[PDB]
Amino acid sequence: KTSFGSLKDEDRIFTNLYGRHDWRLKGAQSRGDWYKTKEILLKGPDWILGEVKTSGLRGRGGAGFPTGLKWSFMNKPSDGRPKYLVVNADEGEPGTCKDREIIRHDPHKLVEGCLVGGRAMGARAAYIYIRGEFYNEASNLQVAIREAYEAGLIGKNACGSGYDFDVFVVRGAGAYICGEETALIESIEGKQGKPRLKPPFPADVGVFGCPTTVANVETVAVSPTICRRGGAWFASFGRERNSGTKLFNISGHVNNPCTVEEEMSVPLKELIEKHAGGVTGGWDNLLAVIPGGSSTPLIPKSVCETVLMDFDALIQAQTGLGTAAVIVMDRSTDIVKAIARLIEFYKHESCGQCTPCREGVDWMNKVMARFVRGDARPAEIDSLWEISKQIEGHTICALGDGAAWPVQGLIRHFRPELEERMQRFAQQHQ
Amino acid sequence: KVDDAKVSPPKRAEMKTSMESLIHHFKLYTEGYQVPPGATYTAIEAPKGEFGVY
Amino acid sequence: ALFVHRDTPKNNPETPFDFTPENYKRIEAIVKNYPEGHKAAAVLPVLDLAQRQNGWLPISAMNKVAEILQVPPMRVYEVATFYTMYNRKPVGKYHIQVCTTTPCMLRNSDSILEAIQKKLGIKVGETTPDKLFTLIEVECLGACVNAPMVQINDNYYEDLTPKDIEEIIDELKAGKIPKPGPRSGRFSCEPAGGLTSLTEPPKGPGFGVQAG
Amino acid sequence: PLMGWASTADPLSNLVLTFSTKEDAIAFAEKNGWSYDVEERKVPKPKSKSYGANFSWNKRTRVSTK
Amino acid sequence: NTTYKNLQHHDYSTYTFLDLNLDLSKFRMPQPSSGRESPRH
Amino acid sequence: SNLIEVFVDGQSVMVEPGTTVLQACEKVGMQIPRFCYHERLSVAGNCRMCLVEIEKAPKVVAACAMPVMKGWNILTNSEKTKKAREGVMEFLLANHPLDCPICDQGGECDLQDQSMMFGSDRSRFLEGKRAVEDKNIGPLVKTIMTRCIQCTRCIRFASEIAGVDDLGTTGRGNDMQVGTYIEKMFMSELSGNIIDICPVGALTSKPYAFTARPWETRKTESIDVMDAVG
Amino acid sequence: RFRGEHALRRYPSGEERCIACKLCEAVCPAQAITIEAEPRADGSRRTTRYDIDMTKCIY
Numbered sequence A: 001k002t003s004f005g006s007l008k009d010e011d012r013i014f015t016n017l018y019g020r021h022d023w024r025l026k027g028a029q030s031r032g033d034w035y036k037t038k039e040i041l042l043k044g045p046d047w048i049l050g051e052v053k054t055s056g057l058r059g060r061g062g063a064g065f066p067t068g069l070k071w072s073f074m075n076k077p078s079d080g081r082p083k084y085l086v087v088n089a090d091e092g093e094p095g096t097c098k099d100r101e102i103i104r105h106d107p108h109k110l111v112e113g114c115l116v117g118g119r120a121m122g123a124r125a126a127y128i129y130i131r132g133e134f135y136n137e138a139s140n141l142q143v144a145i146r147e148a149y150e151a152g153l154i155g156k157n158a159c160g161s162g163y164d165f166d167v168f169v170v171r172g173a174g175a176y177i178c179g180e181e182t183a184l185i186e187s188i189e190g191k192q193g194k195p196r197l198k199p200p201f202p203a204d205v206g207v208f209g210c211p212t213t214v215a216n217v218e219t220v221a222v223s224p225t226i227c228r229r230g231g232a233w234f235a236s237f238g239r240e241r242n243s244g245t246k247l248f249n250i251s252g253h254v255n256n257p258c259t260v261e262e263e264m265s266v267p268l269k270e271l272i273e274k275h276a277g278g279v280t281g282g283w284d285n286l287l288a289v290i291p292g293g294s295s296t297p298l299i300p301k302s303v304c305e306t307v308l309m310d311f312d313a314l315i316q317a318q319t320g321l322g323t324a325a326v327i328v329m330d331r332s333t334d335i336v337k338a339i340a341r342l343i344e345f346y347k348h349e350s351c352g353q354c355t356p357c358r359e360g361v362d363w364m365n366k367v368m369a370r371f372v373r374g375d376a377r378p379a380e381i382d383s384l385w386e387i388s389k390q391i392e393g394h395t396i397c398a399l400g401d402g403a404a405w406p407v408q409g410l411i412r413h414f415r416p417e418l419e420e421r422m423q424r425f426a427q428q429h430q
Numbered sequence B: 001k002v003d004d005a006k007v008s009p010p011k012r013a014e015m016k017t018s019m020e021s022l023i024h025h026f027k028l029y030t031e032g033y034q035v036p037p038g039a040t041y042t043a044i045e046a047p048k049g050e051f052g053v054y
Numbered sequence C: 001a002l003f004v005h006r007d008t009p010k011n012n013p014e015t016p017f018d019f020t021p022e023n024y025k026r027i028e029a030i031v032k033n034y035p036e037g038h039k040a041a042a043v044l045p046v047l048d049l050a051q052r053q054n055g056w057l058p059i060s061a062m063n064k065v066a067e068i069l070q071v072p073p074m075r076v077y078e079v080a081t082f083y084t085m086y087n088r089k090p091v092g093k094y095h096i097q098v099c100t101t102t103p104c105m106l107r108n109s110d111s112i113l114e115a116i117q118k119k120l121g122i123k124v125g126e127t128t129p130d131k132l133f134t135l136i137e138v139e140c141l142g143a144c145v146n147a148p149m150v151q152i153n154d155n156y157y158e159d160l161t162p163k164d165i166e167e168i169i170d171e172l173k174a175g176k177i178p179k180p181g182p183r184s185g186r187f188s189c190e191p192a193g194g195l196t197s198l199t200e201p202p203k204g205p206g207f208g209v210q211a212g
Numbered sequence D: 001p002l003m004g005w006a007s008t009a010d011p012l013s014n015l016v017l018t019f020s021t022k023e024d025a026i027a028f029a030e031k032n033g034w035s036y037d038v039e040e041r042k043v044p045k046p047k048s049k050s051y052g053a054n055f056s057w058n059k060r061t062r063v064s065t066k
Numbered sequence E: 001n002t003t004y005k006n007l008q009h010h011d012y013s014t015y016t017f018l019d020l021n022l023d024l025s026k027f028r029m030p031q032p033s034s035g036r037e038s039p040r041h
Numbered sequence F: 001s002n003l004i005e006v007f008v009d010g011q012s013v014m015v016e017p018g019t020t021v022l023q024a025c026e027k028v029g030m031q032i033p034r035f036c037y038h039e040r041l042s043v044a045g046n047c048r049m050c051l052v053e054i055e056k057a058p059k060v061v062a063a064c065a066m067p068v069m070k071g072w073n074i075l076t077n078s079e080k081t082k083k084a085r086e087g088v089m090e091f092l093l094a095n096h097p098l099d100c101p102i103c104d105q106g107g108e109c110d111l112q113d114q115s116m117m118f119g120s121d122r123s124r125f126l127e128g129k130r131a132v133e134d135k136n137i138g139p140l141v142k143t144i145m146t147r148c149i150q151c152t153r154c155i156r157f158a159s160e161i162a163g164v165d166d167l168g169t170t171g172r173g174n175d176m177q178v179g180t181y182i183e184k185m186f187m188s189e190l191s192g193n194i195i196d197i198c199p200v201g202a203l204t205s206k207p208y209a210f211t212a213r214p215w216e217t218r219k220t221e222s223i224d225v226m227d228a229v230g
Numbered sequence G: 001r002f003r004g005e006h007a008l009r010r011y012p013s014g015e016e017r018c019i020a021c022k023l024c025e026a027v028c029p030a031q032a033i034t035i036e037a038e039p040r041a042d043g044s045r046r047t048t049r050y051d052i053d054m055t056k057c058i059y
């Protein structure tokens, strides 16, 4: 086994992070896209399902379900209705920075991923839902799909076999919950973006009631290299319940905020210090750490100096995991105002099916505005703990969960600073 | 009074500035509070004597 | 934020709205994509085409899209009021969006709001007393690994400073549209020191693959 | 005429009894003498609804708004 | 090799997305019908 | 032969296949308090009041649209069931204003009955409480959209039985106005059947509006005229 | 805190304070209150007739 590992090159799954040697179908053919994929896709979808369930791929995008079991849910037999693959390329979660750079720098590997994913479950076509804020990269992806079709390579007679497979690009119109799993499915139908109830599962009812599925761009792009590359060599990184090269990226208070592709098991302290400049003012100056992006509670310093970057380790630390905000925030800034701005973000971006998320994000935003002013009593802050215990599990989607957790984390860790805030305003009044 | 706004009415301050207090005021005076089914008897020591109510 | 129509002419159909048959060729492409039986699904890209063909969309455009896609208009009004791209208020040519939620405010977004404020003159949310400078502050755009960022029409501006902001202001007043890339070095998302990321050019079809 | 009230010469017009079955109702109505009508009970019919049926493919049962 | 090889997106106008999808309409497998032509036919 | 076992508090009963929890609970004698569901309307999961606890699972699931899988045991009288009902009754009365005098639905508001029998006694959320400007559907329908609990019952009714498609949701977050975007006087047949759909006093009768109040009005059986059906 | 005359009040420099919300007829334990309500030419809800039987009023 390994002693928790570190960074090492040629363990990188996908290359061309930024500014690399070229981009074209010829550049993808030189880097290693469109290599012998007829041999792979002319073998059988259950072979790719066995390959993925061998790989132990953890489903990215902060949900937590494994990819192979979800795709095995998709292996219902052949009925009289078509089947779709929906590649979600959204970046909500302020921080996210996940696949903007990826879809600007390597779309042909994404086409590889959606083609292998469609073959692996008998899909008929794929819709790529790009975020509407990304018009230039939607044009670049259109150029890549144009060249892929122009090689006569997907569509009718895709890679020799008589297998029809198309890809479409649908822009968003500016939203947050279109990143979510089923409001996507209704917004592709042209209806206003609103999720469905989960116990009718998307594996049976999808785009107007066709069995489709939704996959995230990291999982899609990493999927065909599992086929063309080593069986469970990908699984040889970090742990065995969860493994892979994930995009651990820092946007916050560092020098050169940026992206790295690393192993799943890694010390977060040595990640932050030894891959993005350093923490501005040294390690001792920083206030706190958030992993996850925005649906994840905060971590203080003494905890994060022992944290390895695994899903099970962060659930043991009672957090989740996400993309590109695995960051610190420094001491001189107000974490009160930071989390209050996060809750204002959630109020400006949430749909309104569920009564409790609407009303709860309303209370939490007005109460955090009062706490930024510092104008309550401590009974109010324990009532805020109570309401954030009331929301979680009572919503359709998990934006209510992602709104309820940072309030919980703030009350878990920075109790006395809020108490001092309220005391300062009491002496200001008196 | 009791710590229950389903039997005793809420007082004026929370009545004029709440929502649920106005709801419980309104339905408490119109409908009447519900009383669970059963037969009871009790008696106090009134100055006449064993004043019973059934 | 004004979710009721309230006719008040310069609105109130019929205000003359009309396409080009080349746009009808685009709509043929868009409803050539979707499966037949669901002509009612192209509302979002057709309505975005209406926004790009008339920079703020009127309600006559909404009735005309409802006439084409044979849906009742109330669903079109739902879609046009739900999302954020569709600006029902009349706006100018250039639309400045200071993107500011969590990392952007944490890296001094207020410098940029105050710079655009006391250079342009008008306040946030509202607009200039001419065209082409509707300023609003907006939620996260995605590219968080760079500065509190600036979206103009289909263009991003990253890794900021007030002086290149002043260059953007004067060159938009004149008519020079600058580069889409970031500023102050590191032309993309970079660790902007000395490549702690990958250095060797990858091989591809010349090393070991697994049976394919 | 003095107040606009509703004076009624109807002593029995404000009695209403609550029973548990129709047979005891008929038995009491014949026991206590007067005539009676039986408006029979009409319970709500059970139906079958599902959200997966609300999102069908070719079938027209479609909410088209949510 | 540190020369930025994109910014071929420097020249994209407001309509190149829809024009590109318009030029990419043919050689497409026929996108089937299903029952009625609409939920209200 | 299409008879599925559920245990409502330990009592077994046999259920049709592909039906909800709520139909089974109405079959055995219970009622779960419910808002956005209605038995002549298609099922939506908006109101989040139909909640109940299913044993051997952490998540409290909805029961207006859970199809009955095999062998349930339903906790309608557990602790967190009543705690979730208390929480949602606290949320629905947050943004609902102080109009219970001048409402038209004193005795017949759903919120008042379910707030007494299922919700808390004391309120919270000292500040806030948004307000919505009203619309004018027509001379028959008085409309005070501040009382609208955003339940989406009138919209499904219009779009599935009236078919007029004039009532939709517009907006996001807290600010979701239900109705017509374009000030069009929604007038059609069955427009009178929407003052009884709306469970709160948001949509009320205009020619009745301020004349009585339901406990004084005694009820009397009758048969319609002027139509062939009655 | 005596109980006498049965007066009504009105707003400061304003109109009547009642609404005809019928709570007092619902709670009058001899039902001496009688309220018949109509709205006037404004739109705000008001009354037509508001009666106390001083015989049946038990104070």
Ligand SMILES: Cc1cc2nc3c(=O)[nH]c(=O)nc-3n(C[C@H](O)[C@H](O)[C@H](O)COP(=O)(O)O)c2cc1C
Pocket (backbone or CB within 6 Å): A058, A059, A060, A061, A062, A063, A064, A065, A067, A070, A088, A089, A090, A091, A092, A093, A179, A180, A181, A214, A215, A216, A217, A219, A295, A397, A398, A399, A402
């Ligand atoms: C609040 C919320 C926000 C989400 N945002 C995104 C997003 O921006 N992009 C995305 O691809 N998926 C997003 N998702 C969906 C998850 O990534 C989920 O994993 C996805 O449905 C399937 O991804 P998987 O292939 O990793 O299973 C979001 C989900 C939730 C609950």
Ligand code: SF4
Pocket (backbone or CB within 6 Å): A177, A195, A350, A351, A352, A353, A354, A355, A357, A358, A395, A396, A397, A398, A399, A400
């Ligand atoms: S929790 Fe809020 S954002 Fe999520 S589905 Fe419910 S109403 Fe929409």
Ligand code: SF4
Pocket (backbone or CB within 6 Å): F096, F097, F098, F099, F100, F101, F103, F104, F105, F106, F109, F110, F111, F112, F147, F200, F201, F202
């Ligand atoms: S609809 Fe509103 S104002 Fe009317 S009784 Fe109900 S809670 Fe009170």
Ligand code: SF4
Pocket (backbone or CB within 6 Å): F147, F148, F149, F150, F151, F152, F153, F154, F155, F178, F197, F198, F199, F200, F202, F203
């Ligand atoms: S007006 Fe009434 S029925 Fe319609 S959404 Fe509001 S509360 Fe529901």
Ligand code: SF4
Pocket (backbone or CB within 6 Å): G017, G018, G019, G020, G021, G022, G023, G024, G025, G035
């Ligand atoms: S009807 Fe009676 S209880 Fe109601 S406001 Fe008027 S006087 Fe008061």
Ligand code: SF4
Pocket (backbone or CB within 6 Å): G027, G028, G029, G030, G031, G032, G033, G052, G056, G057, G058, G059
């Ligand atoms: S009897 Fe007199 S004091 Fe008592 S409620 Fe009636 S009017 Fe008021």
Ligand code: FES
Pocket (backbone or CB within 6 Å): A094, A095, A096, C099, C100, C101, C102, C103, C104, C139, C140, C141, C142, C143, C144, C148, C149
């Ligand atoms: S918050 Fe400004 S880019 Fe994400």
Ligand code: FES
Pocket (backbone or CB within 6 Å): F034, F035, F036, F037, F044, F045, F046, F047, F048, F049, F050, F051, F062, F063, F064, F065
């Ligand atoms: S009844 Fe409203 S959510 Fe099930």
